[PDB]
């Protein structure tokens, strides 16, 4: 009774869920918006022993043609989640509830992928997204990565800094900005805190940030980000589309297939030599900010890939 | 310095770690024990951008021949103070350890149950994967909808319900539960329902595409070895190959008609309490598969 050939997994309040919904409408399809944050209270899910046996709020969704996975909202600290109240009051019960929800919703996504749904970014990619594994995999497939050290050992850090020179530190997984490794950070009272959690240290690449969008083994666009160091009081960011060689294009496509994504925003960064190193592949990349600042279209090509799947 | 050809991930105070360590010891191999509980505060791990730049406590461990992954804390105060910061820090630690295991597996290490298998272990998907592949499974219903339960009971007859996650006793669904007030508590508490199988439980151990033994179960439980069919032995090897486990303890349960259904595969099944009460040898063949991968 409702068209589920294209499913968008995310909150309707998410701006990229909104963007893809508007694009899909403008192209004649209506997406089924699957909002996991309504699961227990305002939703109904039912799974049978057979893979095709999936029932959401009554209706059977055995196999969408394609799926856009914005988020399953698996932990209370996920992006579109507002869980600080429940976590403050009883963090154990809240974390358990989130884990239970995550199990079922993932089972749904993995079932769709098993029936043949083209899930734009399967959750199965997370194993390869693991950053200290991701960069090694990429490098061993022939993609340049920064000199890196993921560690909790202050000596390894001191020796790595001595081998490389100027360094940055950033999270192993995410959740903080990249900083420069200043001299204070190598002092004992600072560097000793690595005993709490490991940190990622890297050669300070001095060239420019580029964002390369890849959809279905085609580069949609490469956007270069430059920092306005002109006025020290209000530094802005300037994003502009650029041309890249076929070499860079094919390396980005190989990277996407290697990690295992269908829609990715590669973050790359150039060295002083002017050559790019791979910083990361994003499994749920955003595009609206870059779409606006660079005056390019990413939502369109994504919607067109999703629609192309329904004819496939 | 230490022999890194065979690695045992987990605390040395874990009883199965002790079993496997002594079992390897009595066979001629001293396993390196990767006590991950000492990771952040009392142990050093370092990863470089090259896959083989893996350094544990100063010593490089590039590619073990085999790894027995057993397991991978007190944070109540931290969680009450700032739960976002604490969750993120735990994610940092766990990401580094997962990256170690993944680099090893990609290098060629035979990891006995790789963490990648977790996606297939997802229960509401694991059972469907086993079903659509021709293996016998109980009729099931994961739900939070009272009507779906009322229809599932009316269809399969007597049924039981277990939790979505696990860690609670399987309970028989009676008609008292299906009444309005009683069942309405389900719309916020999803559970699994399954046709009640009246036959006996069997745990089948598979190690490298071979069934090691089968044990029937019935603080006083009786566990004794069973001879199961070559048909069922092949089915078990196939289920383990499909979920992606080099070593598993499969919980299966027979029905009234004498046909076993697969209940679950365990990604790190315990074997101490079984081997003892049944006078069978699980730790042995496991240590043997481990040492085999060294050749």
């Amino acid at each position: 009774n409702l068209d589920t050939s294209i499913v968008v997994v995310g909150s309707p309040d998410d701006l990229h869920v909104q963007s893809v919904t508007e694009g899909l409408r403008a192209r004649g399809h209506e997406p089924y918006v699957f909002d996991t944050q309504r699961f227990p209270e305002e939703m109904t899910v039912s799974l049978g022993e057979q893979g095709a046996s999936i029932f959401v709020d009554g209706q059977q969704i055995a196999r969408p043609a394609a799926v856009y996975l914005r988020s399953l909202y698996q932990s209370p600290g996920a992006y579109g989640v507002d869980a600080d109240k429940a976590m403050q009051d009883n963090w154990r019960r809240t974390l358990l509830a989130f884990r239970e929800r995550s199990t079922l919703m993932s089972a749904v996504l993995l079932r769709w992928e098993e029936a043949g749904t083209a899930v734009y970014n399967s959750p199965r990619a997370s194993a390869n997204i693991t950053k200290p594994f991701q960069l090694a995999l990429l490098r061993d497939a022939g993609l340049p990565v920064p000199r890196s050290l993921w560690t909790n050992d202050p000596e390894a850090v001191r020796r790595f800094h001595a081998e490389v020179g100027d360094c940055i530190y950033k999270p192993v997984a995410g959740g903080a900005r990249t900083r420069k490794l200043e001299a204070k950070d190598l002092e004992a009272d600072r560097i000793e805190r690595l005993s709490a959690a490991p940190v990622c240290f890297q050669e300070l690449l001095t060239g420019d940030d580029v964002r390369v969008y890849v959809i279905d083994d085609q580069v949609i666009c490469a956007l270069r980000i430059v920092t306005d160091e002109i006025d020290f009081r209000q530094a802005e960011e300037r994003i502009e589309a650029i041309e890249i060689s076929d070499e860079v294009k094919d390396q980005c496509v190989r990277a996407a297939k290697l990690v295992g994504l269908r829609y990715t925003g590669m973050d790359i960064k150039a060295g002083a030599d002017g050559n790019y190193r791979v910083l990361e592949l994003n499994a749920s990349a955003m595009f609206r900010g870059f779409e606006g600042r660079a005056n390019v279209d990413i939502c369109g090509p994504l919607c067109d890939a999703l629609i192309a799947q329904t004819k496939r | 310095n230490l022999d890194t050809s065979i690695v045992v991930v987990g605390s040395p105070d874990d009883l199965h770690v002790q079993s496997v360590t002594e079992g390897l010891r009595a066979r001629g191999h001293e396993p390196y024990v990767f006590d991950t509980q000492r990771f952040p505060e009392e142990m050093t791990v370092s990863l470089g951008e090259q896959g083989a730049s893996i350094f544990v406590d100063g010593q490089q461990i590039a590619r073990p021949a085999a790894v027995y992954l057993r397991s991978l804390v007190d944070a109540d105060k931290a969680m009450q103070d700032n739960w976002r910061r604490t969750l993120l820090a735990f994610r940092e630690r766990s990401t580094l350890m997962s990256a170690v295991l993944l680099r090893w597996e990609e290098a060629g290490t035979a990891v006995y149950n790789s963490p990648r298998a977790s996606a297939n272990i997802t229960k509401p998907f694991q059972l469907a994967l086993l079903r659509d592949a021709g293996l016998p499974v109980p009729r099931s219903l994961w739900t939070n909808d009272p009507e779906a339960v009322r229809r599932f009971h009316a269809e399969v007859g007597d049924c039981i319900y277990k939790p979505v996650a696990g860690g609670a006793r399987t309970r028989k669904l009676e008609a008292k539960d299906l009444e309005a007030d009683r069942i309405e508590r389900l719309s916020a508490a999803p559970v699994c329902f399954q046709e009640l199988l009246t036959g006996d439980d069997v745990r089948v151990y598979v190690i490298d595409d071979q069934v090691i033994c089968a044990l029937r179960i019935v603080a006083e439980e009786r566990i004794e070895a069973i001879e199961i069919s070559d048909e069922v032995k092949d089915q078990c090897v196939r289920a383990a190959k499909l979920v992606g486990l080099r070593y598993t303890g499969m919980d299966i349960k027979a029905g009234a008609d004498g046909n076993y259904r697969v209940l679950e595969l365990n990604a790190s099944a315990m074997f101490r309490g079984f081997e003892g009460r049944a006078n069978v040898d699980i730790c042995g063949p496991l240590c043997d598969a481990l040492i085999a991968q060294t050749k």
């Binding site: 914005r70 988020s71 399953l72 909202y73 698996q74 932990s75 600290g77 996920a78 992006y79 989640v81 530190y169 999270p171 995410g174 959740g175 903080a176 900005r177 600072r190 560097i191 805190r193 690595l194 709490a196 959690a197 940190v199 925003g265 994003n282 749920s284 990349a285 955003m286 | 700032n82 976002r84 910061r85 604490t86 993120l88 820090a89």
Partner: peptide
């Protein structure tokens, strides 16, 4: 924490 500003929203599945 070595990364002081960690917790202080740059959340998980943002990107």
């Amino acid at each position: 924490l070595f990364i002081e500003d960690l917790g202080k929203t740059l959340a998980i599945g943002e990107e």
